[PDB]
């Protein structure tokens, strides 16, 4: 039954581990399909966007410190939307893309666009916006895989930039938050049972406040799994709140100005109603659009047919290796379709190619977003979708 499957999976993984050394990466190593969930990393990112109400609360909050707390709430709430067993998303192919949208209770929509911008090393970029609430998010995921011995990790070097476009700072620019990502570990691979943990530091920074949240690992006897600990501070040394609890259970916030008060409930992740993204019908999706590209693999995963899932996945990744070979032969390199390389000194490697003026009518912003890629039912690809972003910005100003 399943104890026999578990033993054979255990052996398969030991046979991979046997040929490694702590500190080296897993980019060359193919992991088995039975540790895959049925979504691409491009879609997995949208798990973290499933609580837009906290972001809407942040946007309407006048007090800067309280607004920061709501941003922290929005960002922490997404992490527990995650697979239950030891599973990871499919690694996207170079140029794979995924679009999705949300129908928000306030009759507005949220839009999401993403693309895998690099394979060596892996990187994807994503863009998310709620134009009628003046909310814009840009980010990149940069996972650097590492075998560590009894554990392995995705060292998460990406980051996220959140802007409230109609909340201006002293320079008359939108209020900006930069949010980093903790690392994702699997521990117990050598002498235990595998379990996924978050670890190390998550940094959230705004113009006037900052929070360094440590994702702790359990002690031998003391502590719990999934514990977090951090302090909300200004840039002048003043500590205002302490966050504690567990990122997949209840998180607590203690007011540090009142030493007698007790930590109060900040986030109870089992009492939250996530808002899942919507996606265009499969019949309208492109060849390298995530759900369509991986449909044969995920169908086999859903019926636990791992020989077929392994073969279908191999054919996709082998085709990508051949395409990469052809690029070398042609003397060219890949360039993303939807994201332009950022200018030096900025927080992100890549930004969506389309210019979206910060203060223009949100109906014009929505129209510009919908021109980037098919998001809503009925939208069609154009010829221009498939040319590089750097050629689309040349024409975005050549006619001007």
């Amino acid at each position: 039954d399943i104890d026999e499957d578990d033993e054979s999976g255990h052996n398969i993984i030991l046979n991979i581990i046997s040929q490694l050394r702590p500190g080296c990466d897993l980019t060359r190593i193919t992991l088995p399909t039975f540790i895959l969930e049925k979504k691409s990393m491009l879609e997995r990112v949208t798990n973290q966007l499933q609580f837009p109400e906290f972001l809407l609360q942040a946007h309407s909050e006048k007090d800067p410190l309280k607004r920061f707390l709501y941003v922290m709430k929005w960002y922490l709430a997404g992490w527990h939307i995650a697979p239950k067993a030891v599973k990871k998303p499919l690694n996207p192919v170079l140029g794979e893309y995924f679009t999705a949208y949300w129908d928000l209770p306030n009759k507005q929509q949220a839009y999401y666009i993403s693309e895998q911008t690099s394979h060596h090393p892996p990187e994807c970029a994503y863009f998310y916006m709620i134009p009628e609430s003046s909310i814009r998010v840009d980010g990149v995921v940069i996972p650097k895989s590492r075998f560590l011995g009894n554990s392995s990790a995705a060292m998460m070097d990406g980051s996220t930039v959140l802007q409230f476009l109609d909340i201006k700072d002293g320079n008359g620019k939108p209020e900006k938050y930069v949010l980093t990502q903790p690392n994702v570990y699997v521990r117990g691979i050598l002498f235990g049972k595998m379990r996924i943990e978050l670890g190390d530091h998550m940094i959230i920074k705004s113009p006037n406040f900052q929070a360094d949240i440590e994702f702790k690992t359990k002690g031998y006897v003391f502590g719990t799994y999934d514990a977090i600990e951090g302090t909300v501070k200004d840039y002048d040394g003043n500590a205002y709140y302490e966050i504690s609890g567990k990122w997949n259970d209840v998180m607590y916030l203690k007011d540090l100005k009142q030493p007698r008060s007790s930590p109060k409930v900040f986030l109870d992740t089992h009492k939250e109603s996530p808002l899942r993204p919507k996606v265009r019908p499969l019949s309208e999706q492109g060849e390298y659009e995530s759900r369509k590209l991986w449909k044969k693999v995920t169908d086999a995963l859903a019926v636990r047919n791992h020989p077929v899932a392994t073969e279908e996945k191999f054919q996709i990744e082998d085709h990508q290796r051949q395409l990469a070979k052809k690029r070398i032969e042609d003397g060219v390199e890949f360039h993303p379709k939807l994201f332009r390389r950022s200018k030096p000194g900025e927080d992100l490697d890549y930004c969506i190619y389309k210019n979206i003026p910060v203060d223009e009518d949100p109906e014009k912003q929505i129209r510009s977003i919908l021109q980037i890629a098919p998001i809503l039912p009925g939208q069609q690809f154009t010829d221009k979708f498939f040319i590089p972003a750097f050629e689309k910005i040349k024409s975005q100003k050549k006619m001007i």
Binding site: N106, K107, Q108, Q109, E132, K337, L338, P362, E363, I366, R367, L370, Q371, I372, A373, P374, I375, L376, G378, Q379, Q380, F381, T382, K384, F385, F386, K392, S395, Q396
Partner: peptide, 19 residues
Amino acid sequence: VAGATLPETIPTSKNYYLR
């Protein structure tokens, strides 16, 4: 430059009563 065709009416909250 547009990579996608638009819906006939750009959706907003100000025309959701129609939709």
